[PDB]
């Protein structure tokens, strides 16, 4: 019937003044644009069919053509930025926002999907969708006593579109829009569907990726305990965005980091720092590095949770990027920690892996490791045990690495190695 039409036939049908022929041609276009391989989006655009689809979006008396044109425009807007721009230039944003209130659930769902693609293009189209007033009807769609009454796919599409309205920076979403959306985001973060939870966590991670004021807007809503609970989930698609958000939050003030700590997040890091997924380990180690850059009582809470041995383990064996994040964590620990905490770190066996990592080609990790070594040496001096630390570094083959680093291209590494050797070796 409407399978495998040519663009010529689709154009001939849509250009007829027969609404049923137009509907059949629009469905043929939808089916063409829904094929797995090489959807002819550019050909459909060159034929000048976007204005006709946008006009069909407004035929309240023919809901089937509304649905077919909405699906076709959704698939066009899912492509490159130029194709999404073609959809937007056809005037599709206000038409989709009007369809959001359609009495037909599938048409409203398709409008949500299309707006999600458009907003997901980038900050400009995100803010333009917001200016046309999409947030109010979108949130009204979710104004129900219990989210479980809504169709699953419908709720998933709504959550994903809301996440795209929270996405992207330079600039970040409008503050009034973020405040308008956050309550519903919290409610969705307490929903039970794995995909809804994943997309809500992604939205929260987008919102927490910014200055301290954005992080504060998020944490004021009291979502940190739920974020930690989800950090403990078994589905990796949930743990990933939840860990993302928790790390973002700990990049802020010491009080926000303390909110993360009080929620019990540290107790999850034994698993996260040993997680089979390399990305989880890297994100967890970066989060730990930002937590060790906090107050001394926060470093002490890291110690009490037994996480220093896990940092030693990550430093000893892991992907190189995770090892670099662990080196950063150790350097922050030593810069902010007390003498007792630093000597405890030494007692856990940090010297040997920290020295083995000095054979890396990355210059920044060398600088970080040398700074950590200098801080540990300052602590030892404060205790008068600098000779013990010197022999400890010599026994694991570290003094040779430092002497070799004296002859390094970078000036900072040169000077740091020279100073270490002249002052302690």
């Amino acid at each position: 019937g409407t399978v495998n039409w040519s663009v010529e036939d689709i154009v001939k049908g849509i250009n007829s003044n027969n609404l049923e022929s137009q509907l059949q041609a629009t469905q043929a276009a939808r089916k063409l644009l829904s094929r797995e391989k090489q959807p002819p989006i550019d050909n459909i655009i060159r034929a000048g069919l976007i204005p006709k689809f946008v006009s069909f979006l407004g035929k309240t008396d023919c809901s089937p053509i509304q649905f077919e044109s909405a699906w076709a425009l959704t698939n066009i807007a899912s492509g490159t930025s130029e194709q999404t721009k073609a959809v937007v230039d056809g005037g599709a944003i206000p038409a989709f926002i009007s369809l959001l209130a359609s009495p037909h659930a599938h048409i409203s769902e398709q409008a949500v999907w299309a707006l999600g693609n458009i907003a997901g293009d980038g900050s400009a189209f995100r803010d333009l969708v917001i200016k046309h007033g999409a947030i109010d009807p979108l949130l009204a769609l979710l104004a129900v006593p219990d989210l479980s009454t809504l169709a699953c796919g419908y709720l998933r599409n709504l959550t994903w579109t809301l996440s795209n309205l929270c996405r992207n920076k330079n600039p970040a979403p409008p503050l009034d829009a973020v405040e308008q959306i956050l309550p519903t985001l919290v409610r969705l973060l307490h929903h039970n569907d794995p995909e809804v939870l994943a997309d809500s966590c992604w939205a929260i991670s987008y919102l927490t990726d910014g200055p301290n004021e954005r992080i504060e807007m998020v944490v004021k809503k009291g979502v940190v305990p739920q974020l930690v609970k989800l950090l403990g989930a078994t589905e990796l698609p949930i743990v990933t965005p939840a860990l993302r958000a928790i790390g973002n939050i700990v990049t802020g003030t010491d009080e926000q980091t303390q909110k993360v700590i009080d929620a019990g997040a540290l107790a999850v890091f034994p698993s996260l720092l040993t997680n089979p997924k390399t990305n989880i380990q890297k994100e967890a180690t970066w989060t730990m590095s930002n937590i060790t850059a906090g107050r001394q009582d926060q470093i002490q809470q890291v110690v009490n949770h037994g996480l220093v041995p896990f940092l030693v383990g990550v430093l000893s064996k892991a992907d190189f990027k995770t090892q670099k994040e662990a080196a950063w964590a150790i350097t922050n620990y030593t810069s902010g920690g007390t003498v007792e905490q630093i000597v405890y770190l030494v007692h856990c066996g940090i010297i040997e892996p920290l020295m083995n990592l000095l054979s890396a080609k990355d210059t920044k990790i060398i600088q970080v490791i040398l700074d950590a070594i200098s801080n540990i040496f300052q602590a030892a001096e404060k205790l008068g045990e600098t000779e013990k630390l010197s022999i400890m570094i010599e026994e694991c083959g570290g003094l040779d690495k430092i002497e070799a680093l004296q002859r390094h291209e970078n000036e900072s590494v040169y000077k740091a190695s020279l100073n270490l050797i002249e002052k302690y070796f």
Binding site: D209, N248, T251, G252, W286, A293, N332
Partner: peptide
């Protein structure tokens, strides 16, 4: 600060 954002 020693804190590092992404």
């Amino acid at each position: 600060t020693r804190k590092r954002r992404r």
